[PDB]
Amino acid sequence: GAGAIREQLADLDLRTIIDYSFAEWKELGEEGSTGNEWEDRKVGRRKDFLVRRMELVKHFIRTNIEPEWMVLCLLPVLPPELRPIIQIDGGKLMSSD
Amino acid sequence: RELKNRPPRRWSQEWEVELAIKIMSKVIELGGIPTIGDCAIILRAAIKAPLPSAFLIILQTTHSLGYRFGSPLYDEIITLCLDLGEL
Amino acid sequence: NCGIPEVAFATFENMEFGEDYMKPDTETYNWVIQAYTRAESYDRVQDVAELLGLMVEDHKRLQPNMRTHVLLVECFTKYCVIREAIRHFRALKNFEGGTRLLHSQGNFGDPLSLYLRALCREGRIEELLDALETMAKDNQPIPPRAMILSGYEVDYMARYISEGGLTGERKRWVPRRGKTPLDPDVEGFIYSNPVETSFKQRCLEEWKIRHRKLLRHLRNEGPAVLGANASESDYIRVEERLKKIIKGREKNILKPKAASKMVVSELKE
Amino acid sequence: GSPWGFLIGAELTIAQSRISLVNKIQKVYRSQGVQIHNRHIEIIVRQI
Amino acid sequence: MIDQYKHQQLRIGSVSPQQISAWATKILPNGEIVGEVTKPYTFHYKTNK
Amino acid sequence: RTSDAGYLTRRLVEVVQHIVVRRRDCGTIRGISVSPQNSTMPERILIQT
């Protein structure tokens, strides 16, 4: 279930992730390739994945937001009056979905 | 500007081996003692070249231990032991 | 000195696009540079790049001073733009204030500790010696905070009377794996919001990595002119063998080339 | 060189794109008898 | 000519569970919290209360 | 043809809504230079430019 996902979110260290993704980017950048179309387009997607990974991780590092909050555990509920049940004469009710 | 093309050097351990006595000079010109990370690193930085300098002098303040025994000097043909005589 | 960076920038924009008399001064750029390098959150290195660029473009009226190099050394070292720092450090070098002002007091994260520590952990060691000679000119000693690292018992039994794991119950000796968005290492003391990179025991890095400059010229076609020789394959073969470590072949100095000459010829050739 | 070179190249590309786009936009309106000053076109083209 | 500075702000971010609890939980003087909303009782089958 | 025109107006404004005249001379020396004697632009498009 989501418990393992949340615990994993609460486990990996952001700085180590940045270092490892930088190392992977350096490894990918030092390969020529340019011989096969599949090889032509395989490196680009992985490099973009790494770049957005370090972008997100660096944003997480220097902010007041914890990753574990994306896997929520407590659900807020909208105020009642903003989702009212209309009282009509005779007992008719126009509630909210 | 000249730095953009000069080749500094290849691997050569002559001044980095002398750094231990160099940093000792550059730090004890003021208030600071090369120890722990500059004394327990000497035992791993001692065996670089057949030059006893910057190793037999580390014991002037406190150490007098090295890596527990001092077998060097008596383990280098090069030139014979140049009168170590730690006393 | 208000924490929020974009309260001083709004003042700066009131001067950059202002009238003749209210144009920014060399002291003004120092204040805005300082206000951006010690922000408590969010990335701030790109905005420092703008300010340097604007200062560079408006140069026949504005000239840098000691504090501009000092702040740029601090700002470029906190985030890992070390190269960009070493360069600037040099400039500071030729100022009579030395690194004492760059060190300032022990506050602000002790920027002089950052420059010394960060040079070691990345690979730049020859300039670390250059730094040490510069402090010995006028500055007070290497900061104690700059000196912290992780046969005889390396697990000493002697140190553990002097850091907390002793008769005093305040066990200040470091634990490990404490979770939270904090730092379990020391990486200096607490500062330099990125992570410290690992220089391998002051061994292989930045000497094999410097050599890429030598290999850059041989793998590049346009930067190398050479002569006629065997069309355009003499120097290429040197690159082919230089990539795969080293296998003898000390024939001669086949490259003998310069690096772009820093020349900008308008028309052609 | 590389630092000079692409500063030059990007500035040239942006200039050519602006010059092409302004005329391309204005031709459609001038072919239908519609008169609008180039300020309104250029304000949008700069953001493009 | 110093302009009329006006610094306004608008942040947005995911909330911590403690933030939601502080948002909603109301503690009576007797010590009860009872912010959980345990039952799905929309309106009484009786009077519309 | 009136709905598409209305949709284009929404997008045209969206790009430029923050563009406000905030200051006098910003201190620029680069100016777009035009050549009227090229005899390319008629003297009704040249004038309006």
From Swiss-Prot, chain A:
Transmembrane portions of the chain: none
Compartment(s) where it occurs, according to its Swiss-Prot or TrEMBL record: Plastid, Chloroplast
Function description: DNA-dependent RNA polymerase catalyzes the transcription of DNA into RNA using the four ribonucleoside triphosphates as substrates.
Family stated for the protein in its record: Belongs to the RNA polymerase beta' chain family. RpoC1 subfamily.
Subunit structure as annotated in this protein's UniProt entry: In plastids the minimal PEP RNA polymerase catalytic core is composed of four subunits: alpha, beta, beta', and beta''. When a (nuclear-encoded) sigma factor is associated with the core the holoenzyme is formed, which can initiate transcription.
This protein's name: DNA-directed RNA polymerase subunit beta'
Organism: Spinacia oleracea (Spinach)
The gene coding this protein: rpoC1
UniProtKB/Swiss-Prot annotation, chain D:
Coiled-coil residues: none
Compartment(s): Plastid, Chloroplast
Family to which the UniProt record says this protein belongs: Belongs to the RNA polymerase beta' chain family. RpoC2 subfamily.
Summary of subunit composition and partner proteins: In plastids the minimal PEP RNA polymerase catalytic core is composed of four subunits: alpha, beta, beta', and beta''. When a (nuclear-encoded) sigma factor is associated with the core the holoenzyme is formed, which can initiate transcription.
Function: DNA-dependent RNA polymerase catalyzes the transcription of DNA into RNA using the four ribonucleoside triphosphates as substrates.
The name this protein goes by in its record: DNA-directed RNA polymerase subunit beta''
Classification lineage: Eukaryota, Viridiplantae, Streptophyta, Embryophyta, Tracheophyta
Residues of the full protein shown: 1169 to 1216 of 1361
